[PDB]
Amino acid sequence: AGAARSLSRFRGCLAGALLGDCVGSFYEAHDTVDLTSVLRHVQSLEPTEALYYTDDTAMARALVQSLLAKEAFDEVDMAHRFAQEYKKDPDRGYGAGVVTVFKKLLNPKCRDVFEPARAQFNGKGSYGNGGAMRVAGISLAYSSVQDVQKFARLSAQLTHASSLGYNGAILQALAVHLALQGESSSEHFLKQLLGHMEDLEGDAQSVLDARELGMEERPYSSRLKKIGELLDQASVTREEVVSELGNGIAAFESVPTAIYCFLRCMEPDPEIPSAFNSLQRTLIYSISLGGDTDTIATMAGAIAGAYYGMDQVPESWQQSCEGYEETDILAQSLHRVFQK
C-alpha cells in the first residue's frame, strides 16, 4: 500500500467499500449466517459486474461526486445529489425514513437542506448508519482530524441528525482516516479512536441525546472500550460479537462492529482459510456476522481497503461488482484533487 494516503490506499478504500456492499448484499437481514456458506459463495466470484451495489454505494458515489464537483463541502450540492440519485434509481434499498428526507429535498421550495433530517423521529433525527455507510470519501478528501470530524458530521447530518447517527459517521470516518496512515498496532488504532470519541461525547448535547435513550453517558466510547476487552478475550464467537456490539441498522450497533471486524482480522484466523488475504478475511468475517451485512461489510471494507491497499483487492472479486471502474476512477480523482 506504500506511504500514508497513497493512490493505492485511496483505490483500495473505495474498492473495499464496494466489495463489502456488493458481496454483503446476498446476506442482508439474515439473522444468522453460516461461514461455510459465505466461503462457498465467494468461490462463485473466482474464474462481469454481476453483483448489484445498493444504497450504500449509491450514496457514497454521490458524496464523492459532490466533493469533486466543488473541491469542497457544499451542503446544498451534496443534498441535491443524494436526492437526485434516489429519484433516478429509487430501488437501491433505501429505508422509508431517508426517502421522506429525499422527497423534501426534491421540493425546489426547500431552502434549508438540514431541516428534513432534523424533523425525523419526532424532531430527534435518525440514529441510523446511513451517514456512516457513505462517509469514507470524506477521509479521502480531508487529511486533518479536524476536517474529517467537521465534514463527516455535516455530510452525515444531511440525513442523520441524531448525534447517535452523526457520531457514528465521525467514528467511521476517523477509522478510515487512521487506516490511510498505514501500519499500526490494533491497540494504538483503538486508543486513537477512543480518545477522539471521548472528546466528542463530552459535548452537552451528545450527553442529553444518550440519556434520553437510556444509553451509557458516552455510548461510542463505552463500545470502543468493549472492543478492547473483546480483542483480549479467549474464544470469541461470532454470536458473542453480535451480542456485545450488535449487527443492526443503528450506527451504534454497526460502526463499532465494523471496526472490531477490521481490528480482529489484522491477525490470521484458523477458521478462515489462510489462502484468503487480510482484506478478503475481513470481508468474509464481517459478512458472517449477519444482520446489516451490507453496511457492516461496506464499512469494514473501507477501513481494510485503506489499510491494506489495492494490492489486496483481488481482481476477480473487484470485477464482479457493478460500477467497479467508476468507483476506481472516483478514488483516483479524489487523490489527484485532494492529495496532489
Ligand X SMILES: C/C(=N\Nc1nc(=O)cc(C)[nH]1)c1ccc(N)cc1
Residue of the chain from 20, 116, 125, 305 that contacts ligand X (CB under 6 A): 125
Q: What is the dihedral of CA 55, 144, 151, 172, to 10 degrees?
A: 40
DSSP sequence for 255-316: HHHHHHHHHHTTS--TTS-TTS-HHHHHHHHHHTT-BSHHHHHHHHHHHHHHHH-GGGS-HH
128 appears as a binding residue in the annotation: yes
List the single partner that 114 binds among Mg ion, ligand X, none, CB under 5 to 8 Å by kind.
none
217: Cα separation from own chain's centroid: 24
Residue given cell 447517527 in the structure block: 165
Q: Does 291 bind ligand X (CB under 6 A)?
A: no
260 appears as a binding residue in the annotation: no
Region from 124-132, 141-149, 317-325, 332-340 binding ligand X, contact rule CB under 6 A = 124-132
Q: Does 213 bind ligand X (CB under 6 A)?
A: yes
Q: For residues 128 and 291, which CB has a smaller minimum distance to ligand X in the complex?
A: 128
Strand-pairing partners, residue 291, are 30
Q: Does 54 bind Mg ion (CB under 5 A)?
A: yes
- Taking each helix axis from N to C terminus, what angle separates 145-157 and 186-200, rounded to the nearest 10 degrees? 60
Q: Does 246 bind ligand X (CB under 6 A)?
A: no
194 appears as a binding residue in the annotation: no
Q: For residues 212 and 269, which CB has a smaller minimum distance to ligand X in the complex?
A: 212
List the single partner that 102 binds among Mg ion, ligand X, none, CB under 5 to 8 Å by kind.
none
Q: For residues 69 and 208, which CB has a smaller minimum distance to ligand X in the complex?
A: 208
303 appears as a binding residue in the annotation: no
Region from 52-60, 109-117, 159-167, 273-281 binding Mg ion, contact rule CB under 5 A = 52-60
Residue of the chain from 92, 124, 226, 238 that contacts ligand X (CB under 6 A): 124
List the single partner that 314 binds among Mg ion, ligand X, none, CB under 5 to 8 Å by kind.
none
Report helix, strand and coil shares of the chain as percent, to nearest 5.
65, 0, 30
DSSP sequence for 157-189: HTT--SHHHHHHHHHHHHHHHHHTT----HHHH
Contact 262, 252 (CB under 8 A): no
Contact 250, 127 (CB under 8 A): yes
* Number of residues near Mg ion (by CB under 5 A): 5
Contact 158, 85 (CB under 8 A): no
253 appears as a binding residue in the annotation: no
Q: For residues 160 and 196, which CB has a smaller minimum distance to ligand X in the complex?
A: 160
What character string, x for contact with Mg ion (CB under 5 A) and - otherwise, covers 5-44?
----------------------------------------
Which among 218, 244, 251 is positioned nearest to 230, based on CA atoms? Answer: 244
55 appears as a binding residue in the annotation: yes
Q: Does 56 bind Mg ion (CB under 5 A)?
A: yes
The least CB distance from residue 168 to ligand X, in Å, is 11
Gyration radius from the chain CA atoms: 18
Q: Does 39 bind ligand X (CB under 6 A)?
A: no
Strand-pairing partners, residue 250, are 128
Q: Does 131 bind ligand X (CB under 6 A)?
A: no
- Taking each helix axis from N to C terminus, what angle separates 75-88 and 55-70, rounded to the nearest 10 degrees? 140
Contact 227, 260 (CB under 8 A): yes
Q: Does 205 bind ligand X (CB under 6 A)?
A: no
Residues that bind Mg ion (CB under 5 A): 54-56, 93, 294
Residues that bind ligand X (CB under 6 A): 121-122, 124-128, 162, 212-213
Binding-site annotation: residue ranges for Mg(2+) = 28, 54-56, 292, 294-295
